[PDB]
C-alpha cells in the first residue's frame, strides 16, 4: 500500500470496517484530545492513565468519532494511523535504515496533510532505534513535535510516563498530559452496556442487565491491581466464555463464579451443600475445637456476614483478638477456621509475632522502602495476600511484638488495606484477621470464687486503644473444663491413630484409659498441652518402645488397657 | 475556573453537604469548609497549602471520615483521597517511601508514594493518618511543605502542595482523653470531658511536635466525643450501609424507631460512638440478618423490619 | 600475557630496569615457598600501602634471572597485571570477560606465566556482581588446581573486607604478610637504592641524609608508610637539587619535608 500502512494500522479505516469496539462515555477525554490536536504549536496529547483505564480506547473512540462525523471541522476526515515503533525498527539492520523509514513516515504525513499519528507506548519512543551509534526516534521527532509539523497522540501509562518520559524532560514538554482517569462504576456500566453487542456476537450468549451491574460493582472492590474499565470487561468476557463452553444467558451469578475462581474470593450465591455447611459452621468447627463455644460463634458469624453479602466493603471480614490462657485453642481455632474455608490449615497465613521484637522488623510486614535491600521482595505479609485475598491471617502472639509493630496495622483494620513498600495498597478487606494474644494461678488480693475483665483491661494497658477500637470482637477464652478434656483425649488419640498408625496398626482405647489420660492431663491454668504431654508420656512413648521392640508391631491392633 | 452558579450553591451549602456524612462535629466541618471556600473564592495565600489541618481527638469519631467526606465533596469518591498514612512510617528511612529513593538506589524511577500522587493532581486532599506514629525526621521533611507548598523529592525535583488540603490526623489525645471521666471531682459531661480535656489534647501536640511545625499548620481541631443526640442520627447513617448495596438486591431493610433507639443505647460510649455503634450494628443487626439470609427466612422479595419485642 | 595490560617483570629484571631490593629476602622466600606448591600456589602479599609489596616481586623477578629459583620457578616469566586496566573500557557485555579470557589463554599456550595482580579488592566485583561473571569467578577454577600462579597484593583491610568475607577465596590465595619495615631496615633499603637516585638526579646523596629520612618521616608523617615516605624524601630532594642547579644532605632533604607538612620554618 503506502508507507503509513506498513508501520501502523489505519485506525479510522478499521473504524469504517467496524472492527473497533464502541466507546461509550469518554466524551470529555475525546473532546480534550481534539482541542489539543487543534492547537498551533504543540498539538500532541499524551493520554496518560492507570493501566486499564482505556487510554487506547479513547483514540479508538476518536477514530470512530472521525468517521462518524462527530469530529470538528479542523479535524475533519483526518486518517488516524496508530504507529508500531516495533514495526519501524524491524529489519533496520543498516545505518540510516531506521531513520529513513521514520523520515519516510514523516515525509508522508507532511505530503498528505491529513494524518493524526498515534504513537501508543510513547515511552518506547525514546530509545527506539537506539544502538551503539544512531539517533533514536525521540530525538528525530523533537523539532517536529514542538514546532507543530506533526500531530501525534501519545498514550502511555502513569508509571511509564514517570519512568521514561519525565526522565527525558525535553520530551515531556512536547506533549500535553490528558488525564484519562479510571472511570467510575456508574461509568463502567455504560461501557459494558455499549460492549454488550460485541460479546453477544462473539460468545453467542446474551449477557443480562444485572450481569453488567454486577461485573462493574464486583470488580471495583474485589480487585485492586487492575482498573475498572478492563477488569469489569474481564468478568463479562470470561463469563461469556463460560457459557460458550457449556453449549443461554450470562447471569448475575455467572459473573461472581468467574470472580470467585479468579481472586479466590467466594462472591457467588451459595450451593445447597455450602449453605447447609455454613449454617453447620459452629458444629463443624467444633470437630476440632473442643469447647470455646463463644469463640467459635464469634468467628463463624464473621464468615456468615461475608457470605450473606453483608460484608462491610471498607472493613475486613473479621478482626479478632483471641486473647486467653495459653493452650486452650487460640492457634487451633485459627487453624480450624483455615481448614474450614480452605481444606487445610497450611492456607493459614500465620505471621509469628514473636519474631518481631523491635521496631524495625515491621519491614517484614510490608517490605523494604525504596533504596534498600529487600525492596524487590516487597513484604512477607502483603505478598501473601495479593495471591490469596480471601485468607485467614493469623498474628500469633501479638503481645510479644513491639509497641509499634501493631501500630502499622491501624489502617489494616478500618480501611482494610496496607500500603506496600513498593507502593501497592493490598486488599486486606476479604481477610479474617486474628490476633492471638497470650493472657498461672490466682491474682493479687481477696476475691470471691476461683477473670475475663483482667484480660480485657490488660489489653487496654498493653495495646494502644486506637488498635482495640479497630478490632471487631475481643474474645477472652475459657478455661478448658474437665468435661472438655475428656473430649480432648479423643481428639489427640485420633492424631496418632490413622495418620501415624498407617502401619496396618489400629489404636483402641478403653473408656477407663481415656479417663486416666483426662485425670492426668487436666490442670485449669494450662489446658490441652499438659494433656498432649501426658499422651506422649503414657501412650505414644510406651507405644514407640513396643513398636521398635516389636512387642506389638505392624499388622496388629493395639488396645490400651488402663495401667493403674 | 470561574464558578458555575450550581457549584457556587454547593460551596455555600458545603457544611450541610458534609454533614450528610459527618454527624456532629460542628467546628470541624466548618473550619475545613472554610478552607475550600477561601480557595475557590481566590483568597488563598499563594505560598502555603490550601489547608493544613490537624484532626486531633478521640480515635475514630470522624477524623478519617471527614477527610473522606471532604474527598467526596471535591471529587465524588474516596479513591481521590491521597491517604498516605503515617502509622507505618515508624522508622526514619521509611521517609524514602514518600520521596522515592535518591538516584542510584533501587526504586528511584518509580519511587514516591506521596509526591508522585500529588504531582498528578496538585488539588488533592492528602490524609496523613496517625501522624504521631511516624519518625521525627518525616516531620522535618514535611516542614518544607508547610512553608513553601513545595517539596524536594528523592529524585531532586519539586512538587506542588500549594493546592493540597493537608490533613494531619493525630490520634494523640488518647491517654486520659480516651478515659471518659478525667481525674477528681467535677460536674457532668461538657465540664469533665471538653472543659477538663481539650487543653490536654493541645498539650500533647505541643510536646510531641516541634513548634514551627504547629505554627505553620493553620488549624488544630480537637474533636468531640459524640453525644447521644449525635448517635441517633448516626444509626440512620449506619443502617444505610447495610440497607444499601448489601441489602438493596430485592430486599428492603427498614428499622422501627424502637430499634434505632436500642442501637443508640447499646452503641454509645461517652468517649466514642462511631466504632462501638459499628460493632453493635454488626453484632445485633448484621449477624442476625446474615443467619436469616442464608437460612432464607429473609429472602429476596421481602421487606424485613427490625423491632424490639422486649420493651 | 600481552604487554598491553602489564609488563614482563623478568624481562625488565634481565635488563636491570627494576629497583635493587635490599632487605625483604625472607619475604621473597615465603613467596617462593607459596609459588612452589602444586595446588593453591597463589601468594597474596598482605601489607600496608607502599611497604614494598611490588619491591618483593621486583626482587622476585630478579631472582628468576639471578637463579635463586626452586627449579619449579625456573625460567618463569612474571608478567605484572593491572586488574583494573582490564576493567577500564567495559560498558558493554563481554568487554571485561573477553580481555580476561584472552590473558588466561596466553598463559595456557605460553606456559611459564606468574601473574602479579595488585588490588585484589577489585577482584571481587570486577564485573557486575558475584552472580554475574567477574574476575573472582573466572580465575577461581584455575587457582585451586595450581594451573594459574597469581601473586596478590591487598592491604589488610581489603583482605578482610573482600577476601575474608568471600567464601571460597580465602582458600585459593595463601597469605604472605609483608610487614612494615623498621628504621634500620629502611636505611638499608635506601643504601641499595642510592645507585639509582645518584645516577638519575646526577647528585650525591650523603649517608647523613638517609639516617634522617628514616627518622623524620616516622616522626612527622602519619598518613602513609615508611619504605615509601623515606624513599620519597631523597627522591624529591634530588629533584629539587636538579631544579635549583650538587649534594644532598640532611639539610637538602630537610626543606623537602617542610614543603608538605604545615611547618612555616
Amino acid at each position: 500500500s503506502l508507507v503509513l500502512d506498513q508501520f501502523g494500522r489505519n485506525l479510522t479505516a478499521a473504524a469504517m470496517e467496524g472492527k473497533l469496539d464502541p466507546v461509550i462515555g469518554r466524551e470529555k477525554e475525546i473532546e480534550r484530545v481534539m482541542q489539543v490536536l487543534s492547537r498551533r504549536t504543540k498539538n500532541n496529547p499524551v493520554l496518560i492513565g492507570e493501566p486499564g483505564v482505556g487510554k487506547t480506547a479513547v483514540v479508538e473512540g476518536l477514530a470512530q468519532a472521525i468517521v462518524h462525523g462527530e469530529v470538528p471541522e479542523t479535524l475533519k476526515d483526518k486518517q488516524l494511523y496508530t504507529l508500531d515503533l516495533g514495526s519501524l525498527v524491524a529489519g533496520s539492520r543498516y545505518r540510516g535504515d531506521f531513520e529513513e523509514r521514520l523520515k519516510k513516515v514523516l515525509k508522508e504525513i507532511n505530503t498528505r496533510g491529513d494524518i493524526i499519528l498515534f504513537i501508543d507506548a510513547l515511552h518506547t519512543l525514546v530509545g527506539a532505534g537506539a544502538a551503539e551509534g544512531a539517533i533514536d526516534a525521540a530525538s528525530i521527532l523533537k523539532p517536529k513535535l514542538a514546532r507543530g509539523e506533526l500531530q501525534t497522540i501519545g498514550a502511555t501509562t502513569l508509571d511509564e510516563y514517570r519512568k521514561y518520559i519525565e526522565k527525558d524532560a525535553a520530551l515531556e514538554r512536547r506533549f500535553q498530559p490528558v488525564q484519562v482517569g479510571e472511570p467510575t462504576v456508574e461509568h463502567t456500566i455504560e461501557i459494558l452496556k455499549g460492549l454488550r453487542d460485541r460479546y453477544e456476537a462473539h460468545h453467542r450468549v446474551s449477557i443480562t442487565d444485572a450481569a453488567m451491574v454486577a461485573a462493574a460493582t464486583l470488580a471495583d472492590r474485589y480487585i485492586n491491581d487492575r482498573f475498572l474499565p478492563d477488569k469489569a470487561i474481564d468478568l463479562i468476557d470470561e463469563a461469556g466464555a463460560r457459557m460458550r463452553i457449556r453449549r443461554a444467558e450470562v447471569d448475575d451469578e455467572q459473573i461472581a463464579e468467574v470472580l470467585g475462581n479468579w481472586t479466590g474470593i467466594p462472591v457467588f450465591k451459595l450451593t445447597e451443600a455450602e449453605t447447609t455447611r455454613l449454617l453447620r459452621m459452629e458444629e463443624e468447627l467444633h470437630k476440632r475445637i473442643i469447647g470455646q463455644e463463644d469463640a467459635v460463634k464469634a468467628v463463624s458469624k464473621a464468615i456468615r456476614r461475608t457470605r450473606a453479602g453483608l460484608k462491610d466493603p471498607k472493613r475486613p471480614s473479621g478482626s479478632f483478638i483471641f486473647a486467653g490462657p495459653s493452650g486452650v485453642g487460640k492457634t487451633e481455632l485459627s487453624k480450624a477456621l483455615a481448614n474450614f474455608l480452605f481444606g487445610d490449615d497450611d492456607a493459614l497465613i500465620q505471621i509469628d509475632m514473636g519474631e518481631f521484637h523491635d521496631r524495625f522488623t515491621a519491614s517484614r510486614l510490608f517490605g523494604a522502602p525504596p533504596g534498600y535491600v529487600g525492596y524487590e521482595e516487597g513484604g512477607q505479609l502483603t505478598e501473601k495476600v495479593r495471591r490469596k485475598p480471601f485468607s485467614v491471617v493469623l498474628f500469633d502472639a501479638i503481645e510479644k511484638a513491639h509497641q509499634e509493630i501493631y501500630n502499622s496495622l491501624l489502617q489494616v483494620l478500618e480501611d482494610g488495606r496496607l500500603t506496600d513498600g513498593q507502593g501497592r495498597t493490598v486488599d486486606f478487606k476479604n481477610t479474617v484477621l486474628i490476633f492471638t494474644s497470650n493472657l498461672k494461678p490466682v491474682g493479687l488480693g481477696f476475691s470471691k470464687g476461683g477473670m475475663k475483665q483482667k484480660v480485657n483491661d490488660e489489653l487496654k494497658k498493653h495495646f494502644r486503644p486506637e488498635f482495640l477500637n479497630r478490632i471487631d470482637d475481643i474474645i477472652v477464652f475459657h478455661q478448658l473444663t474437665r468435661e472438655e478434656i475428656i473430649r480432648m483425649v479423643d481428639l489427640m488419640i485420633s492424631r496418632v491413630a490413622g495418620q501415624l498408625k498407617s502401619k496396618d496398626m489400629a489404636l483402641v482405647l478403653t473408656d477407663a484409659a481415656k479417663a486416666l489420660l483426662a485425670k492426668r492431663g487436666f490442670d485449669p491454668v494450662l489446658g490441652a498441652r499438659p494433656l498432649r504431654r501426658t499422651i506422649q508420656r503414657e501412650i505414644e512413648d510406651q507405644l514407640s518402645e513396643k513398636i521398635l521392640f516389636e512387642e506389638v508391631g505392624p499388622g496388629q491392633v493395639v488396645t490400651v488397657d488402663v495401667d493403674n | 475556573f470561574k464558578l458555575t452558579e450550581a457549584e457556587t450553591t454547593r460551596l455555600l451549602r458545603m457544611e450541610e453537604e458534609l454533614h450528610k456524612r459527618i454527624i456532629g462535629q460542628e467546628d470541624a466541618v466548618k473550619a475545613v469548609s472554610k478552607a475550600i471556600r477561601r480557595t475557590r473564592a481566590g483568597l488563598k495565600d499563594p505560598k502555603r497549602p490550601s489547608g493544613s489541618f490537624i484532626f486531633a481527638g478521640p480515635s475514630g469519631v470522624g477524623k478519617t471520615e471527614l477527610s473522606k467526606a471532604l474527598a467526596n465533596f471535591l471529587f465524588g469518591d474516596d479513591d481521590a483521597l491521597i491517604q498516605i498514612d503515617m502509622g507505618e512510617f515508624h522508622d526514619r528511612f521509611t521517609a524514602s517511601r514518600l520521596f522515592g529513593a535518591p538516584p542510584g538506589y533501587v526504586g528511584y524511577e518509580e519511587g514516591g508514594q506521596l509526591t508522585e500522587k500529588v504531582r498528578r493532581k496538585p488539588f488533592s486532599v492528602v490524609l496523613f493518618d496517625a501522624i504521631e506514629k511516624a519518625h521525627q525526621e518525616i516531620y522535618n521533611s514535611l516542614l518544607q511543605v508547610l512553608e513553601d507548598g513545595r517539596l524536594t523529592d528523592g529524585q531532586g525535583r519539586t512538587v506542588d502542595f500549594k493546592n493540597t488540603v493537608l490533613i494531619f490526623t493525630s490520634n494523640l489525645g488518647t491517654s486520659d482523653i480516651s478515659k471518659p471521666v478525667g481525674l477528681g471531682f467535677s460536674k457532668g459531661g461538657g465540664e469533665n470531658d471538653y472543659e477538663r480535656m481539650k487543653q490536654k489534647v493541645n498539650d500533647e501536640l505541643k510536646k510531641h511536635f516541634r513548634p514551627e511545625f504547629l505554627n505553620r499548620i493553620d488549624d488544630i481541631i480537637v474533636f468531640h466525643q459524640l453525644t447521644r443526640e449525635e448517635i441517633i442520627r448516626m444509626v440512620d447513617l449506619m443502617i444505610s450501609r447495610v440497607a444499601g448495596q448489601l441489602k438493596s438486591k430485592d430486599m428492603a431493610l427498614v428499622l422501627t424507631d424502637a430499634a434505632k433507639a436500642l442501637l443508640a443505647k447499646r452503641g454509645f460510649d461517652p468517649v466514642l460512638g462511631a466504632r462501638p455503634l459499628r460493632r453493635t450494628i454488626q453484632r445485633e443487626i448484621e449477624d442476625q440478618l446474615s443467619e436469616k439470609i442464608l437460612f432464607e427466612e429473609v429472602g429476596p422479595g421481602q421487606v424485613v423490619t427490625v423491632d424490639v419485642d422486649n420493651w | 600475557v600481552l604487554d598491553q595490560f602489564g609488563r614482563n617483570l623478568t624481562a625488565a629484571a634481565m635488563e636491570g630496569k627494576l629497583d635493587p631490593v635490599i632487605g625483604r629476602e625472607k619475604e621473597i622466600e615465603r613467596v617462593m615457598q607459596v609459588l612452589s606448591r602444586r595446588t593453591k600456589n597463589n601468594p597474596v602479599l598482605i601489607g600496608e600501602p607502599g611497604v614494598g609489596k611490588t619491591a618483593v616481586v621486583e626482587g622476585l623477578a630478579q631472582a628468576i634471572v639471578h637463579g635463586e629459583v626452586p627449579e619449579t620457578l625456573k625460567d618463569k616469566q612474571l608478567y605484572t597485571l593491572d586488574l583494573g586496566s582490564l576493567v577500564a573500557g567495559s560498558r558493554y557485555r563481554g568487554d571485561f570477560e573477553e580481555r580476561l579470557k584472552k590473558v588466561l589463554k596466553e598463559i595456557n599456550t605460553r606456559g611459564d606465566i606468574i601473574l602479579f595482580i595488585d588490588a585484589l579488592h577489585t577482584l571481587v566485583g570486577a564485573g557486575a556482581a558475584e552472580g554475574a561473571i567477574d574476575a573472582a569467578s573466572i580465575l577461581k577454577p584455575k587457582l585451586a588446581r595450581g594451573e594459574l600462579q597469581t601473586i596478590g597484593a591487598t592491604t589488610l583491610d581489603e583482605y578482610r573486607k573482600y577476601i575474608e568475607k568471600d567464601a571460597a577465596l580465602e582458600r585459593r590465595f595463601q597469605p604472605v604478610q609483608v610487614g612494615e619495615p623498621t628504621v634500620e631496615h629502611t636505611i638499608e633499603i635506601l643504601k641499595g637504592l642510592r645507585d639509582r637516585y645518584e645516577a638519575h638526579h646526577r647528585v650525591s646523596i650523603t649517608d647523613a641524609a638517609m639516617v634522617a629520612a628514616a627518622t623524620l618521616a616516622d616522626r612527622y608523617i602519619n598518613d602513609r608508610f615508611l619504605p615509601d615516605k623515606a624513599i620519597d624524601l631523597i627522591d624529591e630532594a634530588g629533584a629539587r637539587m636538579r631544579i635549583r642547579r650538587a649534594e644532598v644532605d640532611d639539610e637538602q632533604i630537610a626543606e623537602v619535608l617542610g614543603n608538605w607538612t604545615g611547618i612555616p620554618v
Binding site: 543498516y94 544502538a131 551503539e132 533504596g371 534498600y372 | 522508622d91 533501587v106 | 558493554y92 568487554d95 554475574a132
Partner: peptide
C-alpha cells in the same frame, strides 16, 4: 546500641548488549 544499620542498596550498575548498525 539499637542504632540501625540502613543497608542502602544501590541500583544495579550492569552491562549493556548492543544492536549494531550493519555496514559492508
Amino acid at each position: 546500641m539499637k542504632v540501625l544499620i540502613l543497608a542502602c542498596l544501590v541500583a544495579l550498575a550492569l552491562a549493556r548488549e548492543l544492536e549494531e548498525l550493519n555496514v559492508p
